[PDB]
């Protein structure tokens, strides 16, 4: 069909572009900080193990 009111290819392209931008921002943060684990989003058990090793 040739339709004007809905465009699905654009929706899917938007979602892919957003995923790529998120990944790039995460990498930029990790290079700026120098650490792999900046939150518990990253690795939760490693966070606690590293707190104990830090103590």
């Amino acid at each position: 069909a040739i339709t004007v009111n809905t465009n699905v290819t654009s929706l899917k392209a938007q979602k892919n572009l957003n995923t790529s931008a998120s990944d790039l921002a995460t990498s930029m943060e990790r290079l700026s900080s120098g650490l792999r684990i900046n939150s518990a989003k990253d690795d939760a058990a490693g966070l606690a193990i590293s707190n104990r090793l830090n103590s």
């Binding site: 193990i49 104990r52 090793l53 103590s55």
Partner: protein
């Protein structure tokens, strides 16, 4: 005098024996006497055993 220094050295050997740790788990006290396994592959059973006696 000689024996007093021998006793202090034996005390420090015992202290190193009970104090060494990885974070909070003791290593030279007998907890690894029967080793622990680390899975070093992607499938079950592909693992290496680390054994340390007291």
């Amino acid at each position: 005098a000689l024996k007093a220094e021998m006793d202090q050295l034996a005390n420090e050997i015992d202290e190193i024996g009970k104090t060494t740790a990885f974070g909070t788990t003791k290593l030279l006290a007998g907890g690894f006497s029967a080793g622990k396994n680390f899975q070093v592959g992607a499938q079950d059973g592909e693992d290496i055993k680390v054994t340390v006696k007291a």
